Design a protein around this nucleic acid. Sequence first.
DNA 1: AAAAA
DNA 2: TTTTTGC
DNA 3: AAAAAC
Length: 357
Amino acid sequence: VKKISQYACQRRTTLNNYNQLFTDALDILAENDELRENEGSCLAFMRASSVLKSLPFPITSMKDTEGIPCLGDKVKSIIEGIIEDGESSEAKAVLNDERYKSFKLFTSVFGVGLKTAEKWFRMGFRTLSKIQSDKSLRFTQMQKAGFLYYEDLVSCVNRPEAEAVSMLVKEAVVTFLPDALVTMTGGFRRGKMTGHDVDFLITSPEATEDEEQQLLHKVTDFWKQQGLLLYCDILESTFEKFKQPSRKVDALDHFQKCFLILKLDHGRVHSGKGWKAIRVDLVMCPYDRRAFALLGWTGSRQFERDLRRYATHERKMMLDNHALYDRTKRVFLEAESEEEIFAHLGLDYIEPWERNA
DNA sequence: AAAAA
DNA sequence: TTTTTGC
DNA sequence: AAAAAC
Ligand SMILES: Nc1ccn([C@H]2CC[C@@H](COP(=O)(O)OP(=O)(O)OP(=O)(O)O)O2)c(=O)n1
Ligand SMILES: Nc1ccn([C@H]2CC[C@@H](COP(=O)(O)OP(=O)(O)OP(=O)(O)O)O2)c(=O)n1
Ligand SMILES: [Mg+2]
Ligand SMILES: [Mg+2]
Ligand code: NA
């Protein structure tokens, strides 16, 4: 009776996936299209996987797919094949493809993305040992850290580790800004038990322009003094309070942020070398943009993209990590909470643990 | 690859 | 049919 | 440079 929306921001997606046999296959097919730079086919498989993740029951026949959006003929053929013998011949062919295998392996290194992975593949590299020992290749500072702490970074961060990191971040931050509000964002805020990193949003209601700018520098210098800072890259803010919206933009938000690798001592974890390398991201935003930043950094990636797609196509609004603009009313819409952003968009509030699209 | 214009 | 798909 | 980092 209730029609499933094509938008992830109009669906409740918890971590209880009843269709993992279908979505694991669709995620592999999407990933292969991402590698082949086939953006359209990639996004169609990501949308199909996302909608099946929201279902409160497992698909057991083709009749069960009736009325479900984002499931076209190609996707229904994949579902039919999995119903047939419990396997996807299409996803199995991708898992055995040499280009696909190399891309997964090379991009598993921190500092290596799609372009460097494609370059190494076309050069004839197939293993990380052959890449690392090559005398002609030159590695970025990020890739050097990626190879040095590879085993720790490839093993994902669990909840006791994320909590131990949260304690470290909070206690370092409130030492320099006692009124600062520190929120863990990303997957762990959505209820995940694991993650590739631990993300935090930091904001302060009373800090000055200089205090706000200096906090990430003070906190990382403090960790450097303790020999806990394994990698650090601080990106200064390019945030402009009244910036013009534009629907053609690239990647990262304009807030001050830092991409870190921290040394997490085993003694700090309440669950070898005695420590684990952990990827940590810290974002500092101005107090009045805290709701937009929290919403953008909570994710999931599919939830964020459908929020923006819904704002554009259904409400003639422009949304990003800093603001919400109404093109008809010609006004920016302010918000003190995520709930107020959802209400401006005319969406029922979706809890963070329901944003696992 | 799917759905809207 | 052509356009859009977060950004 | 691009590419990487979300
Ligand atoms: N293409 C992307 C990548 C990230 N994000 C946002 C939403 C999630 C947040 C953090 O990025 P990740 O750390 O990659 O997300 P994750 O949800 O925390 O997943 P993981 O569990 O792997 O750390 O940034 C986004 O909107 N779009
Ligand atoms: N137009 C250009 C300029 C440079 N490069 C490539 C080849 C060398 C590589 C060097 O990056 P640098 O920033 O010059 O390297 P680095 O200074 O030696 O040190 P780091 O480890 O911090 O990256 O970039 C390129 O492809 N096209
Ligand atoms: Mg994360
Ligand atoms: Mg992150
Ligand atoms: Na990578």
